[PDB]
Design a protein around this ligand. Sequence first.
Ligand code: HEM
Ligand SMILES: O=C(Nc1ccccc1Cl)Nc1cc(C(F)(F)F)ccc1-n1ccnc1
Length: 462
Amino acid sequence: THSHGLFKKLGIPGPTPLPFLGNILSYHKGFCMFDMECHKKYGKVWGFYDGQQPVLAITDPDMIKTVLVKECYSVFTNRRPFGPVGFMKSAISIAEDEEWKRLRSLLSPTFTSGKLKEMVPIIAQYGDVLVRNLRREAETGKPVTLKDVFGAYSMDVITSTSFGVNIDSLNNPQDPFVENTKKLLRFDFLDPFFLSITVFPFLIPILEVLNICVFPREVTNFLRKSVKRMKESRLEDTRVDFLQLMIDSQNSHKALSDLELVAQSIIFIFAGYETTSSVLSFIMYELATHPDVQQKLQEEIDAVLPNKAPPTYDTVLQMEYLDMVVNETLRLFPIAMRLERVCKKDVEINGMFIPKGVVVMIPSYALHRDPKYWTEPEKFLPERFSKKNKDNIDPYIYTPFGSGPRNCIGMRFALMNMKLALIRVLQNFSFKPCKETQIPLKLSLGGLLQPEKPVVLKVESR
Ligand code: HEM
Ligand SMILES: O=C(Nc1ccccc1Cl)Nc1cc(C(F)(F)F)ccc1-n1ccnc1
């Protein structure tokens, strides 16, 4: 069509596109598979079309450095729009250009290491809540789905970190916080809706004026009113909360708005609910099929934390083998699967012309399983990140949280929240592969990096 000849005139390889659709039909196996194939059959740089949108994939570590870090503020500043957002336009992950830079500057102190030390005790409380619910699940003698026990833990952590709501989600699934935020799941960009707007981006403004938001409107309105209630109730009571830290910044760039505060509060829930639980389920599955790693980690946890001691910020950063298990699992399963930046101007990077409007993509999943930089990439060898071998890895081929000024702002929080859970559960429980567990676990063919079947494992007291 009009823009389907852009990659041919630049001498860039890629799958031949079909009219009105581009290469969306090649998504029959999902983004992860499709990127790995195009890597094998085209080399280091290739291109494809999401409808009429040209997407350029780069794998050179220097080019990834230029896009994500070097020329970030100048050229590659924003991600591609993904649908009708409504008032959630002010979310930091959705904000663009000057709005994003202000929001990140006014929200960066919220994710300091010092503020994280102050949040460890609160996250610790629901680690003990997790084992109690896990004790009953283990005594039943039946396999346990890890997605639900971790989702309950992640929900409990989010409600206590973002707000002052202290709830046991597993046994109290009736609080309006628990019910509405339970629907804040990841986006399957290969479902009929997101596929349709990817081929029909012209329908996004139509959806917006219909007040059709990508997020559930009932959940957003409830959470906005809840913050309005809490903001008044916190004043009447006159704290360690993502909200309170934002309140303590609003009263003292230019400023942060009341609606902006609500928007960022919801995005923290959206960025943390399933992502933490999904990675936690992935981590425990890999420990069950490789008990040697599970044994050494359990021994290391007992060494740093004798007599089932409670974890502390400093002790968590001390445990090395736990950091190795988390990193290697993220290498096998980068749940973002991709990193995207929009080229706002005509620019040349590392001797390559990038015309304005092209979406530049970094295939995180494809790079993390590339035989070039990784040895036996299909295996779970957590020793790759040993202190001696933790330098050979290129920090721009392994990008689980992204890189540059637009990386995951909650990387330290997520890593601490995940590790705090892993210490408590492993030092009390051991996990064995039940029959229903798929030993060669298969990944889903949709837009999410999730297993084909929910991971079920046998759990027992230690
Ligand atoms: C283990 C779970 C998580 C993983 C694997 C993950 C990964 C990522 C990735 C790959 C990005 C895109 C970075 C890039 O484009 O350069 C991102 C962005 C972001 N994440 Fe996370 N994330 C996780 C959890 C969280 C949590 C719990 C929070 C909230 C406390 C959070 C807050 C954010 C924000 C605010 C951004 C956008 C930052 C920006 O646009 O400037 N993430 N994350
Ligand atoms: O852009 C993303 N990539 C991603 C990261 C982790 C897991 C899965 C994915 Cl696909 N995720 C994202 C998107 C939004 C937006 F929909 F508002 F754009 C808001 C928050 C996050 N997010 C999740 C975890 N950390 C950040």
